[PDB]
Amino acid sequence: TSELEARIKQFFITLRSRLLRFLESEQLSHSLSLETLIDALYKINDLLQQ
Amino acid sequence: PQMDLKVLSEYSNLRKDLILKCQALQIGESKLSDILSQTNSINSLTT
């Protein structure tokens, strides 16, 4: 059971880490960054300059 | 809207820059229409 307690504790580690790295993947696709927005605004500035 | 605070200052500076861009765009469009009407009157007089 002591060899079993390490596996079931590592199972809950590898579950919630795979869960939260999935949750941050779906959230950041529905959020915005402060780099791509500035890149798009650079493009808009270039277009309005032209 | 308006708002690592250095990139926040850079974003607000770019926002003010783009606001000045569209302001100057509207001003230049109206002034170009006025100049075009003026030179249309001048071309009518010369013809």
Coordinates of N, CA, C and O in Angstrom, one line a residue:
Chain A
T1 N 0.8 -1.2 0.0 CA 0.0 0.0 0.0 C 0.9 1.3 0.0 O 0.4 2.3 -0.5
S2 N 2.1 1.2 0.5 CA 3.0 2.3 0.5 C 3.5 2.5 -0.9 O 3.8 3.7 -1.3
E3 N 3.7 1.5 -1.7 CA 4.0 1.6 -3.1 C 2.8 2.1 -3.9 O 2.9 2.6 -5.0
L4 N 1.6 1.8 -3.3 CA 0.4 2.2 -3.9 C 0.0 3.7 -3.6 O -0.6 4.4 -4.4
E5 N 0.4 4.1 -2.4 CA 0.1 5.5 -2.0 C 0.8 6.5 -2.8 O 0.3 7.7 -3.0
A6 N 2.0 6.2 -3.3 CA 2.8 7.1 -4.2 C 2.1 7.2 -5.6 O 2.2 8.3 -6.2
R7 N 1.5 6.1 -6.1 CA 1.0 6.2 -7.4 C -0.3 7.0 -7.4 O -0.6 7.7 -8.3
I8 N -1.2 6.8 -6.4 CA -2.5 7.5 -6.4 C -2.3 8.9 -6.0 O -3.1 9.8 -6.4
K9 N -1.2 9.3 -5.4 CA -0.9 10.7 -5.1 C -0.3 11.4 -6.3 O -0.6 12.5 -6.6
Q10 N 0.5 10.6 -7.1 CA 1.0 11.1 -8.4 C -0.1 11.1 -9.4 O 0.0 11.9 -10.4
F11 N -1.1 10.3 -9.3 CA -2.2 10.3 -10.2 C -3.1 11.6 -10.0 O -3.5 12.2 -11.0
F12 N -3.3 12.0 -8.8 CA -4.0 13.3 -8.6 C -3.2 14.5 -8.9 O -3.8 15.5 -9.3
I13 N -1.9 14.4 -8.9 CA -1.0 15.4 -9.4 C -1.1 15.5 -10.9 O -1.3 16.6 -11.5
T14 N -1.0 14.4 -11.6 CA -1.0 14.5 -13.1 C -2.4 14.7 -13.6 O -2.5 14.9 -14.8
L15 N -3.4 14.6 -12.8 CA -4.8 14.9 -13.3 C -5.1 16.4 -13.2 O -5.5 17.0 -14.2
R16 N -4.8 17.0 -12.0 CA -5.2 18.4 -11.9 C -4.2 19.3 -12.7 O -4.6 20.4 -13.1
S17 N -3.0 18.9 -12.9 CA -2.1 19.6 -13.7 C -2.5 19.6 -15.2 O -2.4 20.6 -15.9
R18 N -2.9 18.4 -15.7 CA -3.5 18.3 -17.0 C -4.8 19.0 -17.1 O -5.2 19.4 -18.2
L19 N -5.6 19.0 -16.0 CA -6.8 19.7 -16.0 C -6.7 21.2 -16.1 O -7.3 21.9 -16.9
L20 N -5.8 21.8 -15.3 CA -5.6 23.2 -15.2 C -4.9 23.8 -16.5 O -5.1 24.9 -16.9
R21 N -4.0 22.9 -17.1 CA -3.4 23.3 -18.3 C -4.3 23.2 -19.5 O -4.1 23.8 -20.5
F22 N -5.4 22.5 -19.3 CA -6.5 22.5 -20.3 C -7.4 23.7 -20.0 O -7.9 24.4 -21.0
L23 N -7.6 24.1 -18.8 CA -8.5 25.2 -18.5 C -7.9 26.6 -18.9 O -8.6 27.5 -19.3
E24 N -6.5 26.7 -18.8 CA -5.9 27.9 -19.2 C -5.8 28.0 -20.7 O -5.5 29.0 -21.3
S25 N -5.9 26.8 -21.4 CA -5.9 26.8 -22.9 C -7.2 27.3 -23.4 O -7.2 28.1 -24.4
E26 N -8.3 26.9 -22.8 CA -9.6 27.4 -23.3 C -9.9 28.8 -22.9 O -10.6 29.6 -23.6
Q27 N -9.3 29.3 -21.8 CA -9.6 30.6 -21.3 C -8.8 31.6 -22.1 O -9.4 32.7 -22.5
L28 N -7.5 31.4 -22.4 CA -6.7 32.3 -23.1 C -7.1 32.4 -24.6 O -6.7 33.4 -25.2
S29 N -7.8 31.4 -25.1 CA -8.3 31.5 -26.5 C -9.6 32.4 -26.5 O -9.9 32.9 -27.5
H30 N -10.2 32.6 -25.3 CA -11.3 33.5 -25.2 C -10.9 34.8 -24.5 O -11.8 35.6 -24.1
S31 N -9.7 35.1 -24.2 CA -9.2 36.3 -23.7 C -8.2 37.0 -24.7 O -8.1 36.5 -25.8
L32 N -7.6 38.1 -24.3 CA -6.7 38.8 -25.1 C -5.3 39.0 -24.4 O -5.2 38.9 -23.2
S33 N -4.3 39.2 -25.3 CA -3.0 39.4 -24.8 C -2.6 40.9 -24.9 O -3.4 41.7 -25.5
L34 N -1.5 41.3 -24.4 CA -1.0 42.7 -24.5 C 0.1 42.8 -25.5 O 0.9 43.8 -25.4
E35 N 0.3 41.8 -26.3 CA 1.3 41.8 -27.4 C 0.6 41.8 -28.8 O 1.0 42.6 -29.6
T36 N -0.3 40.8 -29.0 CA -1.0 40.8 -30.3 C -1.9 42.0 -30.5 O -2.0 42.4 -31.7
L37 N -2.4 42.5 -29.5 CA -3.2 43.7 -29.6 C -2.4 44.9 -30.0 O -2.8 45.7 -30.8
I38 N -1.2 45.0 -29.4 CA -0.3 46.1 -29.8 C 0.2 45.9 -31.2 O 0.5 46.9 -32.0
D39 N 0.4 44.7 -31.6 CA 0.8 44.4 -33.0 C -0.3 44.8 -34.0 O 0.0 45.4 -35.1
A40 N -1.5 44.5 -33.7 CA -2.7 44.8 -34.5 C -2.8 46.4 -34.6 O -3.2 46.9 -35.6
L41 N -2.6 47.0 -33.4 CA -2.6 48.5 -33.4 C -1.5 49.1 -34.2 O -1.7 50.2 -34.8
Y42 N -0.3 48.5 -34.2 CA 0.8 48.9 -35.1 C 0.4 48.8 -36.5 O 0.7 49.7 -37.3
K43 N -0.3 47.7 -36.9 CA -0.8 47.5 -38.3 C -1.8 48.6 -38.6 O -1.8 49.2 -39.7
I44 N -2.7 48.9 -37.7 CA -3.7 50.0 -37.9 C -3.1 51.3 -38.0 O -3.5 52.2 -38.9
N45 N -2.0 51.6 -37.2 CA -1.3 52.8 -37.3 C -0.6 53.0 -38.7 O -0.6 54.1 -39.2
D46 N 0.0 51.9 -39.2 CA 0.6 51.9 -40.5 C -0.4 52.2 -41.6 O -0.2 52.9 -42.5
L47 N -1.6 51.6 -41.5 CA -2.7 51.8 -42.5 C -3.2 53.2 -42.5 O -3.4 53.8 -43.5
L48 N -3.4 53.8 -41.3 CA -3.8 55.1 -41.2 C -2.8 56.1 -41.6 O -3.1 57.2 -42.1
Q49 N -1.5 55.8 -41.4 CA -0.4 56.6 -41.9 C -0.4 56.6 -43.4 O -0.1 57.6 -44.0
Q50 N -0.6 55.5 -44.0 CA -0.7 55.4 -45.5 C -1.9 56.2 -46.0 O -1.7 56.9 -47.1
Chain B
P1 N -11.1 51.2 -24.6 CA -11.0 51.9 -23.3 C -9.5 52.3 -23.1 O -8.6 52.1 -23.9
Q2 N -9.2 52.9 -22.0 CA -7.9 53.4 -21.6 C -7.5 52.7 -20.3 O -8.4 52.2 -19.5
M3 N -6.2 52.6 -20.0 CA -5.7 51.9 -18.8 C -4.8 52.8 -18.0 O -4.5 52.5 -16.8
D4 N 4.9 46.0 -14.9 CA 4.6 46.1 -16.3 C 3.8 47.3 -16.7 O 3.0 47.2 -17.7
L5 N 4.0 48.4 -16.0 CA 3.2 49.6 -16.3 C 3.8 50.4 -17.5 O 3.2 51.3 -18.0
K6 N 5.0 50.0 -17.9 CA 5.7 50.6 -19.0 C 4.9 50.3 -20.3 O 4.8 51.1 -21.2
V7 N 4.5 49.0 -20.5 CA 3.7 48.7 -21.7 C 2.3 49.2 -21.6 O 1.7 49.5 -22.6
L8 N 1.8 49.5 -20.4 CA 0.6 50.2 -20.2 C 0.7 51.7 -20.7 O -0.2 52.2 -21.4
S9 N 1.8 52.3 -20.3 CA 2.1 53.7 -20.8 C 2.3 53.7 -22.3 O 1.8 54.6 -23.0
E10 N 2.9 52.7 -22.9 CA 3.1 52.6 -24.3 C 1.8 52.3 -25.0 O 1.5 52.9 -26.1
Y11 N 0.9 51.6 -24.4 CA -0.4 51.3 -25.0 C -1.3 52.6 -25.0 O -2.0 52.9 -25.9
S12 N -1.2 53.4 -23.9 CA -1.9 54.7 -23.8 C -1.4 55.7 -24.8 O -2.1 56.5 -25.4
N13 N 0.0 55.7 -25.0 CA 0.6 56.5 -25.9 C 0.2 56.2 -27.4 O -0.1 57.1 -28.2
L14 N 0.1 54.9 -27.7 CA -0.4 54.4 -29.0 C -1.8 54.7 -29.2 O -2.3 55.1 -30.3
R15 N -2.6 54.7 -28.1 CA -4.0 55.0 -28.2 C -4.2 56.5 -28.5 O -5.0 56.9 -29.3
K16 N -3.4 57.4 -27.8 CA -3.5 58.8 -28.1 C -3.0 59.1 -29.5 O -3.5 60.0 -30.2
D17 N -2.0 58.3 -30.0 CA -1.5 58.5 -31.3 C -2.6 58.1 -32.4 O -2.7 58.8 -33.4
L18 N -3.3 57.0 -32.2 CA -4.3 56.6 -33.1 C -5.5 57.6 -33.1 O -6.2 57.8 -34.1
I19 N -5.8 58.1 -31.9 CA -6.9 59.1 -31.8 C -6.5 60.4 -32.6 O -7.3 60.9 -33.3
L20 N -5.2 60.8 -32.5 CA -4.7 61.9 -33.3 C -4.7 61.6 -34.8 O -5.0 62.5 -35.6
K21 N -4.5 60.3 -35.1 CA -4.5 59.9 -36.5 C -5.9 60.0 -37.1 O -6.1 60.6 -38.2
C22 N -7.0 59.5 -36.4 CA -8.3 59.6 -37.0 C -8.8 61.1 -36.9 O -9.6 61.5 -37.8
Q23 N -8.4 61.8 -35.9 CA -8.7 63.3 -35.9 C -8.2 64.0 -37.1 O -8.9 64.7 -37.8
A24 N -6.9 63.8 -37.4 CA -6.3 64.4 -38.5 C -6.8 63.9 -39.8 O -6.9 64.7 -40.8
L25 N -7.3 62.7 -39.8 CA -7.9 62.1 -41.0 C -9.2 62.8 -41.3 O -9.5 63.2 -42.5
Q26 N -10.1 63.0 -40.3 CA -11.3 63.7 -40.5 C -11.1 65.2 -40.9 O -11.8 65.7 -41.8
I27 N -10.1 65.9 -40.3 CA -9.8 67.2 -40.6 C -9.3 67.4 -42.0 O -9.7 68.3 -42.8
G28 N -8.4 66.4 -42.4 CA -7.9 66.5 -43.8 C -8.9 66.2 -44.8 O -8.9 66.7 -45.9
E29 N -9.9 65.3 -44.5 CA -11.0 65.0 -45.5 C -11.9 66.2 -45.7 O -12.2 66.5 -46.8
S30 N -12.3 66.9 -44.6 CA -13.1 68.0 -44.7 C -12.4 69.2 -45.4 O -13.0 69.9 -46.3
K31 N -11.1 69.4 -45.1 CA -10.3 70.4 -45.8 C -10.1 70.1 -47.2 O -10.1 71.0 -48.1
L32 N -9.9 68.8 -47.6 CA -9.7 68.5 -49.0 C -11.0 68.7 -49.8 O -11.0 69.1 -50.9
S33 N -12.2 68.4 -49.2 CA -13.4 68.7 -49.8 C -13.6 70.2 -50.1 O -14.1 70.7 -51.1
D34 N -13.2 71.1 -49.1 CA -13.2 72.5 -49.3 C -12.3 73.0 -50.4 O -12.7 73.8 -51.2
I35 N -11.1 72.4 -50.4 CA -10.1 72.8 -51.5 C -10.6 72.3 -52.8 O -10.5 73.1 -53.8
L36 N -11.3 71.2 -52.9 CA -11.8 70.7 -54.2 C -12.9 71.6 -54.7 O -13.0 71.8 -55.9
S37 N -13.8 72.0 -53.8 CA -14.9 73.0 -54.2 C -14.3 74.3 -54.6 O -14.8 74.9 -55.6
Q38 N -13.2 74.8 -54.0 CA -12.6 76.0 -54.3 C -11.9 75.9 -55.7 O -12.2 76.8 -56.6
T39 N -11.2 74.9 -56.0 CA -10.6 74.7 -57.3 C -11.6 74.3 -58.4 O -11.3 74.6 -59.5
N40 N -12.7 73.8 -58.0 CA -13.8 73.6 -59.0 C -14.4 74.9 -59.4 O -14.7 75.1 -60.6
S41 N -14.6 75.8 -58.5 CA -15.0 77.2 -58.8 C -14.0 77.9 -59.7 O -14.3 78.6 -60.6
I42 N -12.7 77.7 -59.4 CA -11.6 78.3 -60.2 C -11.6 77.8 -61.6 O -11.4 78.5 -62.6
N43 N -11.7 76.4 -61.7 CA -11.8 75.8 -63.0 C -13.0 76.3 -63.8 O -12.9 76.4 -65.1
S44 N -14.1 76.5 -63.2 CA -15.3 77.0 -63.9 C -15.1 78.4 -64.4 O -15.4 78.7 -65.5
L45 N -14.4 79.2 -63.6 CA -14.1 80.6 -64.0 C -13.1 80.6 -65.2 O -13.3 81.4 -66.1
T46 N -12.1 79.8 -65.1 CA -11.1 79.8 -66.2 C -11.7 79.2 -67.5 O -11.4 79.7 -68.6
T47 N -12.5 78.2 -67.4 CA -13.2 77.7 -68.6 C -14.2 78.7 -69.2 O -14.3 78.7 -70.4

